[PDB]
Amino acid sequence: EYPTVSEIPVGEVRLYQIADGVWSHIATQSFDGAVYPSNGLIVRDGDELLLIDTAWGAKNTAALLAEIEKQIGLPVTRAVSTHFHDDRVGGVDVLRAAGVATYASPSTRRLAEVEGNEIPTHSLEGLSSSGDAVRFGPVELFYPGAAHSTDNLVVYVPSASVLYGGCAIYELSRTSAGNVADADLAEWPTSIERIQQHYPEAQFVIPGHGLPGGLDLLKHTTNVVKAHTNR
Ligand SMILES: [Zn+2]
Ligand SMILES: [Zn+2]
Ligand SMILES: [Zn+2]
């Protein structure tokens, strides 16, 4: 069964195997006196690994690298951050010092700089217009349009039919909108429909926080966003 907060204390990281050569990584962080979980992805690319997102902070990200070497034993050579917030880029400096090449879209890199957050080194081309997709090793990267943030990317693993939605997709147990200070509420439902149109065959869907499910998570997120819009 999928790990939850009660089973992970801050500073530790769990790995969960989704399919052959595809794992999620789960970590926790405190904020405002509550404890929140957070997901990223690991995908095998021959004899190397691609990482999607940090584990939300420098200490957690060092623990993530140690857990990968203990449990998988292959080198992490590249990492992609899916938007500019600290649960996605916090820990980029640890990755860089370990020899991992770090990547994000130019939009993400600019917004991280304005915020004073850590800045991935390399710029991903071909993702500036809504509906754009590019291949990056064993995954496809897709820019659906503005949603949780103006820069948010989603990631698809074709060999395993795994769709990683990041923070643009909510878990089923979340019934109210989360942090929306940087969101585009007007465009978020349209961006979700672009994901459904491009990846209708997805079998596993991973939100940025909480439990995986199926494609139902997309309509669920639209329902929650529209209710918040009508507040
Ligand atoms: Zn975010
Ligand atoms: Zn998030
Ligand atoms: Zn729902």
Numbering used by the authors: 32 to 262
The authors write:
VIM-2 is a clinically important representative of the class B1 MBLs (which also includes the imipenemase (IMP)-1, and New Delhi MBL (NDM)-1), that have a broad-spectrum substrate profile that includes penicillins, cephamycins, cephalosporins, oxacephamycins, and carbapenems. The B1 subfamily MBLs are di-Zn(ii) utilizing enzymes, with both the Zn1 and Zn2 ions having crucial roles in catalysis, with respect to β-lactam substrate binding, and hydrolytic water activation. As revealed by crystallographic, NMR, and biochemical studies, the new inhibitors bind via a mode that does not involve direct zinc chelation, but which may mimic interactions made by intact β-lactam substrates as they initially bind to VIM-2. The combined biophysical analyses reveal 3-oxoisoindoline-4-carboxylate derivatives as a new class of MBL inhibitor, which do not, at least with the analysed compounds, strongly chelate the active site zinc ions.
Compound 35 (IC50 = 7.7 μM), which contains a 3-fluoro-4-hydroxyphenyl motif at its R1 position, was more potent against VIM-2 than compounds 16 and 17. As observed by crystallography, 35 has the same overall binding mode as 30; compared with 30, 35 is positioned to make additional hydrogen-bonding interactions with Asp119 (3.03 Å), as well as halogen-bonding interactions with Asn233 (3.75 Å).
